[PDB]
Amino acid sequence: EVIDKKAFKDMTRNLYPLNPEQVVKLKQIYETSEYAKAATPGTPPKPTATSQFVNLSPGSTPPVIRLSQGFVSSLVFLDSTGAPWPIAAYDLGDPSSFNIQWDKTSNTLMIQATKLYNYGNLAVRLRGLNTPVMLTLIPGQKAVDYRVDLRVQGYGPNADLLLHVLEGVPPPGSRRLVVSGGDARAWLSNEKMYVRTNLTILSPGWLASMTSADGTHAYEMQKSPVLLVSWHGKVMQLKVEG
Amino acid sequence: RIIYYIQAVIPGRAWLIGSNGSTLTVREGSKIPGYGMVKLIDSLQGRILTSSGQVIKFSQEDS
Amino acid sequence: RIIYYIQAVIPGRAWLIGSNGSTLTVREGSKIPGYGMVKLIDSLQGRILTSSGQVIKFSQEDS
Amino acid sequence: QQEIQQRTSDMLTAATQLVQDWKQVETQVYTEGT
Amino acid sequence: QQEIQQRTSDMLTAATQLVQDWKQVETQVYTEGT
Amino acid sequence: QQEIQQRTSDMLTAATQLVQDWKQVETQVYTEGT
Amino acid sequence: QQEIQQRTSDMLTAATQLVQDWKQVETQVYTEGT
Numbered sequence: 001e002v003i004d005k006k007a008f009k010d011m012t013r014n015l016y017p018l019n020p021e022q023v024v025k026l027k028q029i030y031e032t033s034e035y036a037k038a039a040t041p042g043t044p045p046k047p048t049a050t051s052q053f054v055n056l057s058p059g060s061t062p063p064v065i066r067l068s069q070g071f072v073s074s075l076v077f078l079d080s081t082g083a084p085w086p087i088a089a090y091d092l093g094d095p096s097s098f099n100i101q102w103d104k105t106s107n108t109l110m111i112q113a114t115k116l117y118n119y120g121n122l123a124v125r126l127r128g129l130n131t132p133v134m135l136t137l138i139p140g141q142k143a144v145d146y147r148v149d150l151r152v153q154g155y156g157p158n159a160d161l162l163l164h165v166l167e168g169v170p171p172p173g174s175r176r177l178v179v180s181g182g183d184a185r186a187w188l189s190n191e192k193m194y195v196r197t198n199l200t201i202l203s204p205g206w207l208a209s210m211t212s213a214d215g216t217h218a219y220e221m222q223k224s225p226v227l228l229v230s231w232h233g234k235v236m237q238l239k240v241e242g
Numbered sequence: 243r244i245i246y247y248i249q250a251v252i253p254g255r256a257w258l259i260g261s262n263g264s265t266l267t268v269r270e271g272s273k274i275p276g277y278g279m280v281k282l283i284d285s286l287q288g289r290i291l292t293s294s295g296q297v298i299k300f301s302q303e304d305s
Numbered sequence: 306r307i308i309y310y311i312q313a314v315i316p317g318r319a320w321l322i323g324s325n326g327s328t329l330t331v332r333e334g335s336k337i338p339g340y341g342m343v344k345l346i347d348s349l350q351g352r353i354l355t356s357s358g359q360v361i362k363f364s365q366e367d368s
Numbered sequence: 369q370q371e372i373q374q375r376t377s378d379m380l381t382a383a384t385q386l387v388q389d390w391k392q393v394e395t396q397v398y399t400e401g402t
Numbered sequence: 403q404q405e406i407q408q409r410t411s412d413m414l415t416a417a418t419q420l421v422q423d424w425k426q427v428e429t430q431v432y433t434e435g436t
Numbered sequence: 437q438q439e440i441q442q443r444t445s446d447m448l449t450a451a452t453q454l455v456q457d458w459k460q461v462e463t464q465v466y467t468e469g470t
Numbered sequence: 471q472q473e474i475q476q477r478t479s480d481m482l483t484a485a486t487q488l489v490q491d492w493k494q495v496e497t498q499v500y501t502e503g504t
Contacts, residue, residue, distance in 0.1 A: 003371050003372060003375065004375065006372050007371070007372045007373075007375035007376050007379060008379065010372060010376055011375075011376050011379045011380060011383065014376065014380065014412070015380070015383055015384075015387075016416075017409070017412040017413050017416050018413060018416050018417065018420070023420065026417060026420060026421075027424070030421060030424060037454070037457075039252075039253050040252070040253065040254065042254065043254035043255065043269050043270065044252060044253075044254045044255050046255075046267065046269070046367070046368055047267065048367060052328075053326065060328075061320075061328055061329065061330050063328070064312055064313045064320050064328075066312075066313060069461060070461055070462075072464060087503060088503055089500065089501060089502050089503055090500075090501050091498060091499070091500045091501070092498060092499055092501075093498045094496065094498075095496065095498075095499050096496055099463055099464060100501075101464060101466040102501070103466075103468065104503045104504070105503065110464070110466065112463070112464045114461050115461075119315065138313050138315065141313055141314075142351055142363060142368050143363070143367060143368055168263070272365070272366075273365060273366070
């Protein structure tokens with residue numbers, strides 16, 4: 001009878017040569033190996049959005065676009081006012097290093113870099129212009145240009161802040177003030193205060209006001225250190241420091 | 243004051259979000275407002291070391 | 306005064322942008338206004354050496 | 369002594385048969401009526 | 403002593419089987435109704 | 437001593453595999469909607 | 471001593487590969503839109 005058990009044990013060892021704990025450690029080895037294979041050397045590039053002005057003078061330098069291998073960069077063309085300018089044609093040097101996607105009418109190009117450090121150039125002809133716009137394209141920098149907005153000198157075929165404060169986006173350039181006693185936010189931008197809240201301001205009196213569909217209010221006002229507010233029938237006071 | 247949380251981290255970079263909803267990305271030597279100078283980015287275990295001694299992590303119920 | 310930042314660099318050339326938005330390109334021996342004469346362009350690590358002792362780099366939150 | 373190895377062969381065939389029998393799971397069938 | 407190498411062969415087959423089983427990831431299926 | 441050369445062969449296969457894995461870069465896909 | 475010649479053969483293959491890689495220059499592509 002021990003013959004049967006010994007055969008059962010060598011039998012079990014032949015059928016499953018690897019322990020469960022060995023399976024766990026091999027899986028850990030495999031995932032660590034994949035992480036080391038998938039890791040990137042040095043530091044990865046910085047994701048940036050930029051905006052340039054293109055000068056068509058015979059002394060100026062052509063603009064530079066920073067790219068990265070396998071990633072998509074969008075180029076959008078605007079006029080001096082800022083309206084979109086549709087593209088008439090383009091001409092790409094070195095297509096084995098760069099890949100361009102473009103629907104045949106819009107004003108947006110989609111560029112993917114194929115090689116690591118190989119750089120090139122591109123010519124773009126717009127709809128109304130006689131002057132073509134020439135650009136240079138370099139990949140592999142310490143920053144990668146995700147999107148470039150281009151202001152062109154001529155004229156194309158086409159020629160508020162309280163919304164952002166209601167949405168919660170602070171006005172650009174402002175600084176924060178501290179408000180105590182209730183649900184409100186405040187900023188100071190141009191020696192004017194901007195208040196976002198769901199209370200109703202009663203006493204100091206506003207200059208402009210907006211409301212959303214669910215009832216949030218945004219106010220633009222001059223600076224003052226006190227507010228008198230009533231919440232659904234009750235009067236109280238707010239004190240603003242900074 | 244403001245508290246920053248790790249949104250994503252790879253070797254080299256780290257994407258952080260603040261309690262005001264602002265999003266930033268940092269590398270090894272970079273400036274962070276209210277914390278100081280970054281000294282080490284540890285992609286494993288989700289820890290960021292700061293010159294003031296602070297450690298930047300994930301939000302606890304959001305991690 | 307005016308501060309210049311590296312926009313792009315290859316071996317040989319460097320494209321720089323100023324705080325006024327003007328863009329220039331330079332090679333090894335070239336004139337830069339307010340800085341002097343270029344002595345060495347180091348394509349790795351993003352450093353430009355100048356005859357006045359100054360080093361031209363990337364913007365810190367834009368690099 | 370050698371009986372462990374003969375036993376290993378009949379046992380190997382039976383255990384392989386058992387595990388391959390435990391592997392199969394078949395898709396369910398839905399019948400529509402009108 | 404030689405048991406290390408026999409063990410290496412059954413183990414090699416099992417580990418190759420395990421890693422090839424860990425490699426496959428299949429595309430998701432979207433079903434449209436009207 | 438000869439271990440350097442056996443190691444050279446498994447290592448040669450792994451490094452060739454790694455470099456051929458690092459070579460491929462695939463074209464992007466644009467989807468149009470109406 | 472003979473190492474100079476083995477080195478000459480791997481080096482010869484690599485340098486021939488490098489120079490043939492430096493030879494190719496491809497024509498530009500112009501896209502017309504309407």
